[PDB]
Amino acid sequence: PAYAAEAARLGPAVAAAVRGLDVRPVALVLNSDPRSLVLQLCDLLSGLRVHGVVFEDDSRPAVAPILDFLSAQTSLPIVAVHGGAALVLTPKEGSTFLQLGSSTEQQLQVIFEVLEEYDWTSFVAVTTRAPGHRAFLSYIEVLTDGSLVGWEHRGALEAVLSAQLRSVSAQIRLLFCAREEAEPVFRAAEEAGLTGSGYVWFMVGPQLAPLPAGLFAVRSAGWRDDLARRVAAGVAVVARGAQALLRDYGFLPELGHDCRTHRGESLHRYFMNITWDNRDYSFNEDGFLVNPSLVVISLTRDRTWEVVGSWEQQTLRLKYPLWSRYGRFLTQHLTVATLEERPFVIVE
Amino acid sequence: HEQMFREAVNQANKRHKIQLNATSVTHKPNAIQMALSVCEDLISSQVYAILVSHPPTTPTPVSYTAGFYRIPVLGLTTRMSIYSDKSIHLSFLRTVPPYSHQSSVWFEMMRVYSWNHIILLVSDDHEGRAAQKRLETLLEERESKAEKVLQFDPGTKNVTALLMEAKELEARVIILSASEDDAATVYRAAAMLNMTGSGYVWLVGEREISGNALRYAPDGILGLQLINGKNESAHISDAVGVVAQAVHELNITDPPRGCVGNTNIWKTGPLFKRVLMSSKYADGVTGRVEFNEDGDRKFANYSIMNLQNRKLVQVGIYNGTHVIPNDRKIIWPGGETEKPRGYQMSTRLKIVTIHQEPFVYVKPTLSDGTCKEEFTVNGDPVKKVICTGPNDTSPRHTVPQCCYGFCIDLLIKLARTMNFTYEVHLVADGKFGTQERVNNSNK
Numbered sequence: 001p002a003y004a005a006e007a008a009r010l011g012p013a014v015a016a017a018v019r020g021l022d023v024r025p026v027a028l029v030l031n032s033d034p035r036s037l038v039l040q041l042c043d044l045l046s047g048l049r050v051h052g053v054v055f056e057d058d059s060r061p062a063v064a065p066i067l068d069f070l071s072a073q074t075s076l077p078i079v080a081v082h083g084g085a086a087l088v089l090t091p092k093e094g095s096t097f098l099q100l101g102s103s104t105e106q107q108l109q110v111i112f113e114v115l116e117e118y119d120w121t122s123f124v125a126v127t128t129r130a131p132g133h134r135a136f137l138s139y140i141e142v143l144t145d146g147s148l149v150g151w152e153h154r155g156a157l158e159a160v161l162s163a164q165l166r167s168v169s170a171q172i173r174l175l176f177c178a179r180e181e182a183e184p185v186f187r188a189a190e191e192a193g194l195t196g197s198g199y200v201w202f203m204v205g206p207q208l209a210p211l212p213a214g215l216f217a218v219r220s221a222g223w224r225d226d227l228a229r230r231v232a233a234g235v236a237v238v239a240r241g242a243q244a245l246l247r248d249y250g251f252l253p254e255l256g257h258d259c260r261t262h263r264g265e266s267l268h269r270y271f272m273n274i275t276w277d278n279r280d281y282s283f284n285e286d287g288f289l290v291n292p293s294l295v296v297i298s299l300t301r302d303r304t305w306e307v308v309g310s311w312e313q314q315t316l317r318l319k320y321p322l323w324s325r326y327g328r329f330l331t332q333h334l335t336v337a338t339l340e341e342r343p344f345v346i347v348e
Numbered sequence: 349h350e351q352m353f354r355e356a357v358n359q360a361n362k363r364h365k366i367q368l369n370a371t372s373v374t375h376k377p378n379a380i381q382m383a384l385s386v387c388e389d390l391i392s393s394q395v396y397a398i399l400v401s402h403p404p405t406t407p408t409p410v411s412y413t414a415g416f417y418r419i420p421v422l423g424l425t426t427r428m429s430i431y432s433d434k435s436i437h438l439s440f441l442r443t444v445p446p447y448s449h450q451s452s453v454w455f456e457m458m459r460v461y462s463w464n465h466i467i468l469l470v471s472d473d474h475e476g477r478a479a480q481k482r483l484e485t486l487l488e489e490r491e492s493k494a495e496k497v498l499q500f501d502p503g504t505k506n507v508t509a510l511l512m513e514a515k516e517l518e519a520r521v522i523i524l525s526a527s528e529d530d531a532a533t534v535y536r537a538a539a540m541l542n543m544t545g546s547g548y549v550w551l552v553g554e555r556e557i558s559g560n561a562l563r564y565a566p567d568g569i570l571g572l573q574l575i576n577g578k579n580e581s582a583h584i585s586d587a588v589g590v591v592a593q594a595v596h597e598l599n600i601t602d603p604p605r606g607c608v609g610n611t612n613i614w615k616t617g618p619l620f621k622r623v624l625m626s627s628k629y630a631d632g633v634t635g636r637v638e639f640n641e642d643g644d645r646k647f648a649n650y651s652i653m654n655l656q657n658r659k660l661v662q663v664g665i666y667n668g669t670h671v672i673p674n675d676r677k678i679i680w681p682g683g684e685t686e687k688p689r690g691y692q693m694s695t696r697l698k699i700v701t702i703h704q705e706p707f708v709y710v711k712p713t714l715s716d717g718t719c720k721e722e723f724t725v726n727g728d729p730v731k732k733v734i735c736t737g738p739n740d741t742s743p744r745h746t747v748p749q750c751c752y753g754f755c756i757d758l759l760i761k762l763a764r765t766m767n768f769t770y771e772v773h774l775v776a777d778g779k780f781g782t783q784e785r786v787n788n789s790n791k
């Protein structure tokens with residue numbers, strides 16, 4: 001889709017003029033080939049000397065490490081859009097990455113808010129071979145310590161794999177694994193039978209978007225948005241950053257990147273808060289978006305992902321407000337009726 | 349250089365699949381050409397793994413380019429903790445222990461010398477944070493607290509504020525970890541503040557000892573250095589031997605040989621990394637090598653160096669599980685032949701008292717600042733201590749009053765019988781104390 005993306009950016013995106021920068025819509029998709037991509041990037045930086053070009057990728061994550069390293073070498077900001085190949089990369093070196101992804105911490109936070117709202121206390125934290133997921137486990141433990149989130153514990157863990165996963169049960173499950181490794185887990189779960197309507201699986205991490213009947217994954221808001229909106233958002237971010245740096249002497253070029261570290265200066269000091277397309281689009285030092293907009297996609301029997309709940313400004317609005325948890329959808333759940341009698345039942 | 353690489357590759361081939369060999373790489377001042385050079389090398393050579401040993405003063409470009417296509421590489425020089433995590437660098441492996449191991453040995457050394465106290469002077473860089481986290485985890489596993497963990501500021505001067513904070517603390521022991529410039533700056537301030545000597549013991553890493561020893565290292569430090577650090581700079585023979593064994597161990601496919609246009613990743617790359625971890629190169633060259641955790645091997649002995657006689661000396665080595673000190677006596681900063689106590693008594697306790705009528709009366713002082721002295725029922729001086737506390741709940745800022753009563757009388761007796769030096773101080777807000785819940789954090 002690289003050729004299609006370039007065509008969709010040259011024709012449509014060029015005519016787009018969101019909004020100061022001398023030439024806003026100046027850019028070029030320029031086709032995977034790290035050597036050619038870096039060489040072309042240096043050529044444009046030396047000649048164009050633009051204040052940054054929005055990058056769009058379609059591959060489902062090695063591109064991000066190279067892009068940030070190139071940005072640090074060039075000492076120029078390069079925003080990442082079109083989620084995919086730009087998933088977090090929490091560690092950073094001085095550089096200005098400004099990626100538009102969603103970190104695991106917020107994804108875990110939104111999921112727990114949904115779980116508490118739906119009265120889904122029981123949960124597990126099954127995980128495959130550790131791709132450096134120690135942070136994810138720690139965050140869950142921190143969130144668990146509270147008033148009601150506490151529930152049954154779990155662990156991290158082919159017939160042996162199926163037995164280990166089925167030895168904790170607890171209905172609700174939390175999964176964190178790569179696509180290449182998650183597939184064997186799904187097959188093992190399917191063989192164990194924990195993939196029907198009797199269980200709900202929350203898959204978080206870089207998955208993005210035999211699948212179990214109940215699947216809930218949290219992804220960044222506007223994931224289904226067209227690439228035209230993505231490029232427009234990236235252009236707006238660059239324009240907002242230029243305006244933010246306009247509060248002082250705005251004629252501060254990067255000297256022409258570095259083609260023929262040394263500067264040791266980032267750009268997050270000035271570019272900290274911007275507002276565009278409503279939502280919460282503000283970048284942090286680590287490169288995330290503080291208080292980002294998130295949605296909770298759900299998988300139905302039609303193999304379709306639909307928005308169930310939206311998170312924005314620490315507000316959780318979700319359709320399908322099932323008051324009852326359907327706890328015994330797999331007994332131990334009783335629907336107890338009653339009536340108000342002051343000596344016996346007092347309701348306030 | 350090329351000659352050493354050819355010798356190492358030739359030895360690896362003779363050690364004993366199809367024309368197995370490695371091609372050396374030439375570093376460049378700018379990483380842009382470095383990435384291009386490695387990309388051409390990988391496309392042509394298509395070698396399973398790449399060895400990086402550039403002594404710049406950069407391993408980032410090689411590891412970052414190895415990340416694409418999932419081609420694991422081995423680094424032999426860099427020891428920065430940023431490479432320890434495989435989430436960012438999933439194609440980077442090395443044998444030298446990380447700087448977090450320095451924290452592990454420090455804890456072992458601290459436990460050896462019957463020390464339970466520390467003032468962790470750690471730099472604010474990522475390496476410093478990782479060392480603090482590793483040390484804190486080890487201390488937590490032993491139910492031990494670090495006391496003060498006051499941070500630092502890389503590339504900053506006039507850091508006497510942190511030194512003043514550490515000096516007032518009871519414990520007199522500092523485990524310092526920072527860069528050469530930071531170590532020199534802290535050492536100069538410590539020397540000018542009478543902090544290097546008396547009952548102070550310094551523990552520093554390899555970088556701190558070398559840089560500090562160059563500029564301003566006092567003759568009381570206790571640094572740590574790798575047993576074969578210099579050899580590790582030229583021990584590529586072990587790397588080639590381990591890599592050859594890993595390939596000989598193992599349904600595999602040839603790594604991609606095309607760099608100009610490629611998106612597919614190596615399917616067996618993760619498998620090669622998994623087999624490499626399982627590999628146990630027990631040949632014994634430069635010590636036993638065994639990969640630990642992910643990306644590093646925790647099988648290297650650590651030596652201890654001291655600045656006695658204005659020269660680095662060996663005072664023992666680390667066996668891998670327990671230190672083995674058998675060299676000459678350690679010359680501490682004060683010059684004493686015995687290890688100075690790591691903890692200092694603090695006979696200046698500050699006492700908090702709450703206004704209770706039967707026990708602790710509270711009365712305002714007179715104009716001169718000392719409240720009137722009365723006599724007991726049977727006739728005797730009443731012991732009153734000048735206490736400081738809020739006036740109303742009015743200055744409302746530490747109005748000096750005088751306290752007396754049951755508890756204060758008991759306190760005076762305790763101080764006399766055990767040598768206190770008390771300075772009473774009433775509670776800021778009148779309240780005995782209870783566990784309140786704030787922001788979902790009861791404690």
Ligand SMILES: *[C@@H]1O[C@H](CO)[C@@H](O[C@@H]2O[C@H](CO)[C@@H](O)[C@H](O)[C@H]2NC(C)=O)[C@H](O)[C@H]1NC(C)=O
Pocket residue numbers: 354357367368369370371392393394
């Ligand atoms: C190992 O074998 C490879 C070929 O498989 C050699 O690579 C060639 O090296 C020459 C000289 O540098 C180049 O001109 C060729 O273009 C290389 N071809 C490939 C396929 O990479 C390599 O030189 C050999 N190295 C040793 C140490 O014998």
Ligand SMILES: *[C@@H]1O[C@H](CO)[C@@H](O)[C@H](O)[C@H]1NC(C)=O
Pocket residue numbers: 576578579580581582
């Ligand atoms: C380390 O010791 C080994 C012993 O085999 C030696 O070959 C190597 O050259 C030494 N290190 C250096 C770089 O001098």
Ligand SMILES: *[C@@H]1O[C@H](CO)[C@@H](O)[C@H](O)[C@H]1NC(C)=O
Pocket residue numbers: 667668669670671
């Ligand atoms: C040295 O460490 C090894 C690690 O396996 C241990 O088996 C051995 O007993 C230790 N010896 C001493 C003296 O610490």
Ligand SMILES: *[C@@H]1O[C@H](CO)[C@@H](O)[C@H](O)[C@H]1NC(C)=O
Pocket residue numbers: 695766767768769
């Ligand atoms: C307690 O003993 C020490 C040591 O002799 C002495 O200096 C001190 O004055 C004594 N009591 C106090 C704290 O007054």
